[PDB]
Structure 1
Amino acid sequence: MEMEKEFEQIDKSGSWAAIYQDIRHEASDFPSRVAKLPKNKNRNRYRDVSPFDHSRIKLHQEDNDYINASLIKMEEAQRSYILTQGPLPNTVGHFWEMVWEQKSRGVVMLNRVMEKGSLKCAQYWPQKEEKEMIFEDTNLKLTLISEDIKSYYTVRQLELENLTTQETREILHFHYTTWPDFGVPESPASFLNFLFKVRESGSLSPEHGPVVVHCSAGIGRSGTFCLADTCLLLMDKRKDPSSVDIKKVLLEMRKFRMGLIQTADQLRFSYLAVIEGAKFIM
C-alpha cells in the first residue's frame, strides 16, 4: 500500500497512537546483560535504554570493553549505522576510542548540549582552534580545524590523533541545531536538507566505517535519521518503490537497538520525511 495513502488514512482516522503501540508490542526483546553489570552503572545515561548484547559495540581494551552503543546493519539497503547515547563526563574518552576503532568518517548530533534547561550530553568536542582536547584514559587528541554555521545546522572539521601511533584522521561533525525542545519539526524540509548534506560528505558510504549517530538517549531523533535514510535508499534500489513498508523497516532496525522512534509524533514525522524526500528524488 502506497505509504502516502496509508498516511492520509491514519491522519483522517487519528490512529497514530494505535499504530505506534502495535510496533511497541511486536518489537524484539533480546538480553542486555553486559549493560546491567554493576561495574557499568556510570557508563549509562538512562536506566531503561541499553544496547542488546548481540549487537553492542565492543571497545578494544581488556579492562572494560563496554559502551552504550549498537551496530544497526541493514542487509538489503547495504547501510550500517552506530547509534549511541550522548556522551557522559566519564565516557567522552570511550566515545572517541569507538570512532577511532570503528574507522568512522562522520558523527551526527541531533540535540543541543542544553535543552529544557538541563544537560543532555557532555561538551565532547573543542569550541576554539587553539584549545584542543586530550583524553588521557584512551590516549587521543582532538583539534577543531574549521566550523561552518548555517541556519538549521553546523558542520565542523575535526582532527583526531591516536597519541600511541601519531596517526591522524579527519572526522566530520554534523550538528542539527534546530530540533524543537518539545514535539517534532512542522516541515521535514530542513531535516531532509541535513540528511542530504551528510550523504554528500561520504560519511554514510561503504569506503568508511559506520557513521556514529546520537541524540540524548540515541533512540528517538537518532531513530528518525536512520529510518528515513534506509527507506529512501530502498525506494531507489527496488523495481516497485511502493513496496517499501516503513513499519517493517522500523521493526527490522529494532532487532539491533531497543526503542527506536520514541513517540507517535516521531513516527508520523518519519512518514512525512520519507514521503517528501521520495518526491524530491522521484
Structure 2
Amino acid sequence: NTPREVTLHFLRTAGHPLTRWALQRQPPDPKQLEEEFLKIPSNFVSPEDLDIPGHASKDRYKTILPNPQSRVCLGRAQSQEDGDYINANYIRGYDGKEKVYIATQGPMPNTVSDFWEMVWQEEVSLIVMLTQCVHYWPTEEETYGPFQIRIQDMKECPEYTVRQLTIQYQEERRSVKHILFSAWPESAGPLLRLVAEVEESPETAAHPGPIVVHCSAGIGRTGCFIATRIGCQQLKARGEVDILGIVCQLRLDRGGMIQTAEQYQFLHHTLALYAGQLPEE
C-alpha cells in the first residue's frame, strides 16, 4: 500500500493510553517519548495536492498548508473578493466530536477580513491567541470589509489579556470573547489557567460554534494547546489519557500539529500537573 495510506493507517491505530497513576508516578522517560514522537508522520499536504487557484497569497508559509479533507470553506459575505479559501482546519475534540476547534495561522493584513468572515459564519464565540502577526483586532473601533468590530471591555490578567469584542454585520451584532496568552513555556501553570479560562467561557452564539485557536503558523503552539485541552478532558472523565492517540488524531485534521519533541514531553508534564490538581473530590 502507498506511503500515503501508510500515513493514514498509523494516525488511526497508534495509541499509548496512560493511567492517571502512570502519568504522574512512572511516566515514559524522555528518550522513549522522543522516539515515539518521531514515529508519528507529519501528514503535511504538498502544494500539488491542493487545487485551489490563488491560495498562495493567502498563506503565511508555503510549506504549511490546510488539509483539504477538513479545511474551512468561506461563504460569500465579501464582494471585492472571490474565493472560499482560508488557511484553517476543523479540529475534532474529545471523543472525536466534530468541529470543536479551528486551528488557523496568524491573520495577515490581506486575510483579516477572511478571518472575521470565518468567525461569523461558524458562529465562533471564543478566540484563543498564542504568542510571545498583524493586529487584526481594533484598539477602539475598526471596519474590516463588511464587518465592524468594537472593543466593549478589556481586562488585564497576570498571564493573558481578555478582550470582549462585538462583531457587527448590517443589523446583526454578536459577542466574541478574545484571550491573548503572553508567555509562549517555562512552566505549565499559566497554560492550565488558560484552559480553565476557556472552560469557564459561556457560549454566546445561537448554535455552539468551534473555538478558534491561532499562533503564527497554527500547528506548533496551537497543537499543544488543543492537545492539552482534550488531554485534560480525558483525565477528568476517564482517569486515563492517550496522548499518542490525541496527537495522531490532530495530524489527521491539520498536518504537522506539535512540531518538536520538547513540546511532546512538555505535554506530558502539563497533564501530570493537571492530574494533581483534580478534585479530591
Shared fold by TM > 0.5? yes
Aligned-residue offset at 1:38: 4.7
Aligned counterpart in structure 2 of residue 255 of structure 1, from 252, 255, 259? 252
Q: 2:136 aligns with which of 124, 144, 147?
A: 124
TM-score, normalised to structure 2, is 0.83
The aligned runs of 1:48-67 (5 Å cut-off) are 48-61=63-76, 63-67=82-86
Q: Report how many aligned residue pairs link the two structures.
A: 255
Deviates more, 1:142-151 or 1:31-40: 31-40
2:28 maps to 9
Counting only pairs closer than 5 Å after superposition, residues 1-282 of structure 1 correspond to structure 2 as 1-2=18-19, 3-4=22-23, 8-11=27-30, 14-24=31-41, 27-28=42-43, 37-61=52-76, 63-74=82-93, 76=95, 78=97, 80-112=100-132, 121-127=133-139, 129=140, 132-136=141-145, 139-163=146-170, 166-179=171-184, 185-202=185-202, 208-238=208-238, 241-242=239-240, 244-282=241-279
- Asked if 2 retains the 8 angstrom alpha-carbon contact of 1:198 and 1:204, the reply is no
**Aligned counterparts of 1:41 and 1:30: Cα–Cα separation in 2:** 14
Counterparts of 2:273 and 2:23, CA distance in 1: 10
Deviation at 1:30, TM superposition (A): 5.8
**Can you list the C-alpha shifts for 1:119-178, whole angstroms capped at 9, x where unaligned?**
xx1110012x3xx11112xx0001111111122100000110013xx1001110010012
Q: Deviations over 1:94-113 (max 9, x none)?
A: 0000000000000100015x
Structure 2 unmatched runs, 5+: 1-17
Relative to structure 1, the CA distance from residue 6 to residue 65 in structure 2 (aligned partners, 3 Å threshold; closer, same or farther) is: farther
8 Å contact from structure 1 (residues 77, 234) kept in 2? no
Local SS of the residue matching 1:270:
helix
Q: State the alpha-carbon separation in 1 of the partners of residues 117 and 230 from structure 2.
A: 27
Deviations 1:45-87 (A, max 9, x none): 0111111111000001292000000001236264710000000
CA distance in 2, matches of 1:245, 1:206: 33
* Kept after mapping to 1: 8 A contact 2:161/2:179: yes
- Partner Cα separation in structure 2 for residue 105 and residue 65 of structure 1: 21
SS of the residue 2:161 aligns to: strand
Does the aligned pair in 1 maintain the 2:94–2:233 contact within 8 Å? no
| Structure 1 unaligned residues grouped into runs of 5+ | 113-120, 180-184
Could you state the TM-score of these two structures normalised by the residue count of structure 1? 0.83
Whole-angstrom CA distance in 2 between matches of 1:198 and 1:150:
14
Q: How far is 1:267 from its partner?
A: 0.7
